[PDB]
Every structure is written in structure tokens, then in C-alpha cells.
Amino acid sequence: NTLVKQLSSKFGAISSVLNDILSRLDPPEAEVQIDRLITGRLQSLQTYVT
Amino acid sequence: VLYQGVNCTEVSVAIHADQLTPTWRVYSTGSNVFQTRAGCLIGAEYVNNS
Amino acid sequence: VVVLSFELLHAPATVCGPKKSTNLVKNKCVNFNFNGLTGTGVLTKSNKKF
Amino acid sequence: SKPSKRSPIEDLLFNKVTLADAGFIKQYGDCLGDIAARCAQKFNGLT
Numbered sequence: 001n002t003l004v005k006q007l008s009s010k011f012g013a014i015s016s017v018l019n020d021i022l023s024r025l026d027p028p029e030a031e032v033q034i035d036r037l038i039t040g041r042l043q044s045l046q047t048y049v050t
Numbered sequence: 051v052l053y054q055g056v057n058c059t060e061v062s063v064a065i066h067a068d069q070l071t072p073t074w075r076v077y078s079t080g081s082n083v084f085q086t087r088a089g090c091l092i093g094a095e096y097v098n099n100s
Numbered sequence: 101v102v103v104l105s106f107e108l109l110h111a112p113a114t115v116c117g118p119k120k121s122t123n124l125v126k127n128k129c130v131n132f133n134f135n136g137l138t139g140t141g142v143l144t145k146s147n148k149k150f
Numbered sequence: 151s152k153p154s155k156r157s158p159i160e161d162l163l164f165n166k167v168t169l170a171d172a173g174f175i176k177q178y179g180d181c182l183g184d185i186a187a188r189c190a191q192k193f194n195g196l197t
């Protein structure tokens with residue numbers, strides 16, 4: 001439940017949903033917002049595995 | 051090939067419609083498709099003998 | 101100077117771009133776009149009371 | 151006398167513990183209902 005609920009976190013991004021980031025922003029900015037989400041999700045998965 | 055967590059009917063429909071991401075196909079015949087609780091197993095003949 | 105301020109978070113949006121609509125496809129895996137909200141999935145009649 | 155051929159005590163032990171996952175090909179619970187958790191609904195990549 002914790003691992004799934006973490007998907008709604010923004011981790012500093014404008015939106016937790018990737019489709020909104022890609023829809024609103026051009027790749028040069030969308031990649032920044034996505035990297036913020038990737039970092040947060042990677043940390044959540046690494047914590048889960050540990 | 052075991053398609054984990056999916057009903058064999060849905061897999062067969064997706065195969066006939068060419069809707070699957072992997073583009074390889076396991077040759078499907080009668081007695082080569084078996085539904086188990088782990089998923090749909092295609093390419094192995096189920097037998098009664100243990 | 102003109103500043104165009106807007107919120108992209110509320111669901112009941114009223115100002116959409118000049119994008120053409122398509123018909124509605126249900127019970128199939130479809131890439132949908134509803135007022136800017138996008139995704140891939142199967143649409144079905146809902147029993148939810150909005 | 152009952153399916154699964156478990157002892158009376160085993161039947162009690164199984165009824166007293168409540169399982170969350172009870173994994174199966176649970177593709178029938180994905181429509182209508184309340185889309186209850188299970189905890190990714192096989193939608194967010196957790197099975």
C-alpha cells in the first residue's frame with residue numbers, strides 16, 4: 001500500500017501523472033519534471049526492496 | 051511461454067487481433083494452451099500423469 | 101503586456117484548444133483524450149453516480 | 151468428508167487467518183464494483 005500510494009507524490013514535479021507532464025511541456029522541460037519523478041519512484045522501489 | 055496473471059481467452063483474443071507488444075508468437079494448437087493459477091501456459095501439453 | 105493566468109488541475113474545464121473530436125469507442129483498448137486528460141485503456145459504461 | 155481433505159483444526163486455522171492477496175487470475179474484479187485495492191490492482195505493476 002505504501003509503494004502504490006507513493007505514485008501520487010509529486011517529488012517537486014508539477015504533476016504526479018506523466019501524461020500531464022508530457023502533454024503540457026516540450027521534451028527539454030518534460031525531461032526535468034520526469035527526472036524528478038524518476039528519482040522519487042526509484043527511491044520508493046529501493047526502499048521497498050530493502 | 052507463461053503469460054503470468056492473465057486468462058488464456060484474453061491472450062488468444064489479443065493474439066488474433068495482433069495487439070501484443072512482444073511480436074514473437076508461440077505456435078498455438080489444441081492441447082498446447084493450459085490455464086493455470088499462475089497464468090496462461092502456451093507451448094506445453096498438460097497431462098494427467100503426475 | 102497581457103498575462104494569461106490559468107489552472108490546469110480542475111476537472112470541469114471550459115476553455116479547450118481547437119482540437120477535433122472523434123466518436124466514442126467502448127469495450128476496446130483505445131488511446132483516449134478527454135478534455136486534455138489522456139491515457140490508454142478500455143472504456144465501459146460506469147455505474148458510478150457523479 | 152470435505153473438499154481439500156483438511157483436518158478440523160486446519161479448517162479452523164485457515165478460517166481464522168484472513169488473507170489479503172489470495173492470488174489468482176483476478177481479472178473479473180477490475181470492472182465496476184469499487185476497484186478494491188489488490189495492492190496495485192494489477193494496474194501499477196505490482197503483482
Ligand SMILES: *[C@@H]1O[C@H](CO)[C@@H](O)[C@H](O)[C@H]1NC(C)=O
Nearest residue numbers: 057058059085086175176177
Ligand atoms: C477466463 O474467462 C472466462 C470468460 O471469458 C471465464 O469463464 C473463465 O473462468 C476465466 N478463467 C480465469 C482463470 O480467469
Ligand SMILES: *[C@@H]1O[C@H](CO)[C@@H](O)[C@H](O)[C@H]1NC(C)=O
Nearest residue numbers: 081084095096097098099100
Ligand atoms: C484426465 O482424466 C479425466 C477423467 O475424467 C479427463 O476428464 C481429463 O480430460 C483428463 N486430462 C488429461 C490431460 O488427460
